[PDB]
Point group: C3
Chain length 621, copies 3
């Protein structure tokens, strides 16, 4: 039992009482909110050639004093907030696992109690760190996580639920020992870069206090780590031989600036088949996966040596250059708003639909959208169809994560008290890069095209990173920050620093660091380098459209109130409102009784309003 | 971009702007409705020993009554209307893939925009044709698809939603080069055979114009097809050796007229085990699947040679003869209506269940719109349990086929269903045994159960399936000789060329679904099959009329009732309770439904008279 | 074809008409309720290396699978599974289709009988027929197969499945806190009726002329290679099971260490043996040694005697904001139980799969049971309730239902989560659920405790009858795995409220069942002594931070503005704060808030509207 003091908050950490069969377990309590986190890792290597790690943040209707609402089966699926919290925890702990740890691992977060004051998501990140630290699972160093808010210009750590509602920033920082940063998740109300950057420094300061608390609990408990029967990393001598075979061929491919996404992959694949064939004779006893992974290591090393040594990228760009950006608006007549955003070989189709205000709130049946409510009646829905990468797939977590990230980016510029629910759909028709950030740019374009009076245009961009690190020390010697990374740059790089905002502020941030932490200095520069790129993108978007249209499209939704006499009300509504629901199903009209005499009527198109209108007139005789 | 003019309708095709990563992609636009279709095919041979082809017609609903129902409510699943459209597209393109193309393939549809006037389903079929034509995926020929309706006696190509709502015919035709037919899907309001047949030839004429437009687009943009790693067809040397080994034994099996479904299958299997082991020794290098497929090729060709050469089927029937048909009603006393229809070794049990009109809607604006209200309060649910074929199957239920067969049988019976029936009519067809057209038996059994339940249907409906065996020149590809079979078994469908299911009254046609396994068939064969099925339909309707010929004078005495109970204004709070608790508590323990009709009166629906009696107890005990 | 008379009830059994393609099929009719049951078994051995048997009982009337259907499938699976031969590793499915229901005769019992007839007439290798009846107690008299009206007034709902020679195969009961002598008598009455049903089925089998298939191979280890395994691992396994310092994990790995050593030695001696045949031979030898210690020495593997309980510790009120909570530990099994109060109208609005199954419980009470994968140090998918967790939740809910008070102002929901598993977590859910209910302040009549009884028998293979046996109190996981039954029974200090016997043998005598009920009442008494020390009576009131209900009056001229267009304002408030405003009459709105703090914020909404 260790208590960590963070300003005016206390963080109680416990272990050894509950769930003792699990490989690791911990209970983290702040105020009256308690979260138990367990960690299980199988000792048999998984047949798949990667690290299978699943994080399931399990919210409970209990622990909050709420029996599940009106539906027979009491729990159905996964809420949006549950998936997002699971994603944050996964990104905080995944980089710290060793290389070649191909063992099935699961982290589960059970909510013991919730007081409605101290948020449990931050505790779940800390609990995952304690559970993994006390377990025998090989894991590298504790992780501290805090949330930073700005209330009246003051930087508050772990704000209460009341404080979040008055905060211009929602930043979550996960830090490793010696002030490294492992995860960044921000949702700001278009705040200045200086204020945003200070909050990161204050956050990393607090996560170091948590880490020292966990290290004390680990020392007292007396943790000993297991010895995995095998870490699946290619041997140095097989890797070195691969380097001799395919270094020159790979060097020519990545210096060939005429390659596109498919041509580059095919050219690399041709060397892969050629090289893997000759590797077997020299090493007949090597595992078939070990042969594959040796090529991936060599291809990654050659790819990174070019940008570090020569400051030029695989497509010939310099470190700060964007890809070609093209925008269109108003492509299909019947859509309320539309936009096609192209960034290199990434293409996104964004659509705006206006729905009724009543459809903003969802209730009953399933859990995924059980208590459906959004602050501004605005939601963004992100689709990543399998043909965007020329693939066959089932028609998930990544789509929901990217949809929330793009929705965070656009949320601060959405006007309040809009007549309708605003629903943006982003379809990734082609994918070679940050389709998630293109959804914010295209979403901004479609929003002004539709006539939504947004305060300012929003542009996002992704910043990559390549580092050189010695094995004898582990520190970062030199690094290159890349603007607007490709898919191969993100795959072979060290982070995907996605950040969006207007031309005068920052609205969203999601840093997916693949290294075991990076210095605050690198994070500081990535935010600056993205500010320059974002301004360049916004100038391209502004030429396509610079201000929202003075009105909505003529074929857009319309709301009007009909008068139904008291004598004729029963005929109109029908038995238990059967005629109302029948009308809303054949036509699109949504009818809601404002008053015993009047019915507000919402038609998504002027055609529906006429079609419903004759239904009302004949019913009223 | 190519524009195709179909009468007064305009079709626009284009490619090269959206989703350039896909193997093939196309945008098909009519009016303001634009549909984008994508084709992707893997270059690695699938581990599966057939052609995995999946068609997914997605929809961000705005032609479903302009209610989004997008990802905001997608974690429920896929609508039934989406799966039906995916089945029409799958049937239109599957026959044109080459034999042995064992490669994973997916066709996806994306409704970029829908204006609520032009239906996007037909555009999605044409888009799949264009996307496959421009791609490098080996696909034999372009396909044109139109919808034909009849409004005031005039044929209309691609009718709008307004015209579709006043049309006595909903026919979708997919045509191949040289006026061949690959897909037929129709539902009619009991129209004459001559009117129905004229719509097919009108439809095929329009699909040839579309094929002409698509071929122009394929010429304008260079299209080079890939060379597949290998096409999975048995070696001609292996096939001819299998024929020398199993022709006599297989011929004896197929000329044995005392076999049933199971005994015939095991007799064929016994030859399969004996032959295949002999094949392995002769051809050690042969693939394990090559041995299996070669035997299937020989068994299929021996089976079809008997129908071609001797005009006799494997069960001794002639080409026109039906199987034995038996009917039965009033199986169980408690059911509102029931029937046990049997044809050959296919057995189907059909139940009619009345319900409240209010059970049609779900009180949720979305979800209800996803599966809209049926025009008449009439739906058919079709079940294909695993024991119907003596196999172990998943219990999740309602796969694509069960949803399609249920839709086919529902539109077969829809034209005769009366209007303004006081209750919701639910028909459930359960297939207890299957050796043939259970879907068409569900229409015949469904009409028997409907008549027994006392629903005053206008007339009885019977369905039948017509098979086809052809002799095709190997080089020209033309059909030389063919035989049409009436009321085919399952083996004749498996080894045949088409599954031509068609239902109707004794004076008209109500539904049709032709599942052609050939890369197109001449229209003259389609007309002959429609006429041959007309003869068989009359024979089936004669047998069913002996069991029952007219609907019963009234519904069963243990059937549902509806009546209104008055409550005073002062007593509404105690009656309904706080938060409506009392009403839903009464429904939980009685099953009745109480609806606020007027401020003073409530309508009570009770599934049984006894349930009404219990419900009336609550009202009176509260009354005191 | 064959009619069976059970007092005033008639059972009609027929075959040969419907679904003739299935391996076996039967129709069972009582009154106007008919049930069709089919059985299919593949002739190709399954690769699973066990017996894959799925029972799927489905109600055809669409208006996924309701919880009643899953519970019925569990009873049917329990009634037929033990009678399959050993080594029958063939995929097998049993489907039950309700052709008609009259609303008077319950089709669930007919489905059990139909499954026995369909298996009896089929060619699937299956042991003797099984009869099944339901016994109720109406105004002091014992009724066989009571109707729906009689079941509502019954103090007992007991389902008995019997095998030939009055053996009991399945027992599953829920009683309204009834005496042990009344419970035991009802079992005797039920077994007598199941012999009459078996007589009818045997007559139908003889008339039909059933012949059984010969399976390709019965997957049982060879006797000569099992004997060699005994010569290798006997002494080492004996030492492991006589070491009383082991816990669940250390004992498992000690046996596993012997297993790995033995597998290599077996492989060289029998290289021709199937790799699974080596695995099962060790499983047989280990099971034999484990039971021989109980029979010969009357001492369990953890050092206690046949009647001793495991260590029991309880604890209540562990988190301030929970309405009620309890932590029940029994040996290495740990369960955390929570109580939540919501409104009476909490769960009844739209979207019911079938009518009359809307969200109203009999006492506005329900129990939800969760079995997370870390309870056994395992990895698994966590979304959605499988069949076992639905069955265990229903068993624990039946155990607590009799003592739940009526007319409680709030809907009571109990959640049990198994943090550790080494035994009866389902019965620990009844004990912990009882403690949390008392801590939460709901006035339950008495404390309820549950316990599981094991059984180890020695039967000669010459005839198969039971020579001698031992009944074990509060079994571990290993004692259930290597034992003969999991006899779970719960009740208060003066009665029985629930029972679920999972017999692995092909039937046990009625005297063994009677003794298990008596041995369980002694153990249940000891548990109730420990639980009473922690908390012996419900708290005088609920926690101060619990739910509160207060009415708010709104005038007619203000009704429209307050409710919003189509009740939008009220729907919005429920979405964010969680409070619910329901109309009571033309002037009153009942407000429910999970906490008094959330009520204060909610009251600021009406005042803001003012």
């Amino acid at each position: 039992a260790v208590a960590v003091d963070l300003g005016n908050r206390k963080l109680e950490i416990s272990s050894g009482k509950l769930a003792r069969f699990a490989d690791g377990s911990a209970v983290v309590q702040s105020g009256d909110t308690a979260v138990m986190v367990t960690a299980v890792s199988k000792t048999k290597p998984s047949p798949s050639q990667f690290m299978p790690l699943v994080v399931d943040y399990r919210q409970k209707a209990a622990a909050a004093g709420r029996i599940p609402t009106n539906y027979l089966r009491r729990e159905i699926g996964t809420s949006d907030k549950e998936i997002l919290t699971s994603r944050i925890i996964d990104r905080s702990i995944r980089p710290l696992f060793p290389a070649g740890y191909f063992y099935d691992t699961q982290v589960l977060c059970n909510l013991l109690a919730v007081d409605g004051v101290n948020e449990p998501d931050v505790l779940a990140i800390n609990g995952a760190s304690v559970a993994l630290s006390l377990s025998d699972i090989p894991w590298n160093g504790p992780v501290g996580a805090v949330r930073i808010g700005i209330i009246d210009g003051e930087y508050v750590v772990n704000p209460t639920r009341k404080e979040m509602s008055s905060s211009t920033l929602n930043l979550v920082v996960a830090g490793a020992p010696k002030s490294q940063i492992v995860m960044l998740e921000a949702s700001a109300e278009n705040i200045l870069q200086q204020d945003f950057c200070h909050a990161i420094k204050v956050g990393v300061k607090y996560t170091q206090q948590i880490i020292q608390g966990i290290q004390q609990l680990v020392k007292e408990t007396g943790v000993t780590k297991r010895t995995p029967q095998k870490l699946f990393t290619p041997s140095p001598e097989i890797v070195k031989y691969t380097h001799k075979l395919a270094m020159e061929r790979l060097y020519a491919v990545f210096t060939d600036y005429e390659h596109d996404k498919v041509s580059r992959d095919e050219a690399v694949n041709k060397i892969r088949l050629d090289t893997e064939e000759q590797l077997k004779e020299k090493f007949p006893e090597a595992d078939p996966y070990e042969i594959i992974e040796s090529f991936n290591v060599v291809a990654k090393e050659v790819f990174r040596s070019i940008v570090l040594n020569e400051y030029k990228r695989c497509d010939g760009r310099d470190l700060t250059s964007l890809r070609n950006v093209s925008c269109e608006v108003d492509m299909f007549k019947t859509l309320h708003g539309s936009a096609l955003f192209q960034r290199g070989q990434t293409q996104v189709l964004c659509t705006v639909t206006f729905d009724s205000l009543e459809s903003g709130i969802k209730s009953d049946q399933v859990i995924t959208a059980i208590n459906g409510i959004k602050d501004k009646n605005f939601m963004l829905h992100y689709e990543f169809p399998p043909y965007a990468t020329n693939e066959i797939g089932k028609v998930n977590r990544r789509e929901l994560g990217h949809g929330a990230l793009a929705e965070k980016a656009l949320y601060p510029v959405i006007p309040r008290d809009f007549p309708f629910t605003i629903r943006v759909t982003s379809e990734v028709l082609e994918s070679n890069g940050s389709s998630s950030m293109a959804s914010a740019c295209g979403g901004s374009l479609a929003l002004m095209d539709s006539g939504v009076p947004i305060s300012s245009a929003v542009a996002g961009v992704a910043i990559g990173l390549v580092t050189k690190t010695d094995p004898e020390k582990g520190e970062i010697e030199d690094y290159r920050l890349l603007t607007d990374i490709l898919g191969i740059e993100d795959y072979n790089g060290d982070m995907d620093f996605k950040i969006a905002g207007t031309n005068k502020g920052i609205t969203a941030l999601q840093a997916d660091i693949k290294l075991p932490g990076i210095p605050i200095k690198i994070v500081m520069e990535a935010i600056q380098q993205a500010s320059v790129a974002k301004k360049e993108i916004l100038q391209i978007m502004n030429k396509t459209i610079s201000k929202p249209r003075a009105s909505r499209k003529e074929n857009g939704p319309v709301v009007e109130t009909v008068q139904v006499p008291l004598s004729k009300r029963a005929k109109f509504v029908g038995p238990g409102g059967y005629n109302l629901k029948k009308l809303q199903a054949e036509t699109g009209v949504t009818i809601s009784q404002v008053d015993e005499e009047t019915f507000s009527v919402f038609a998504p198109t002027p055609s529906a309003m006429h079609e419903a209108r004759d239904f009302i007139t004949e019913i009223c005789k």
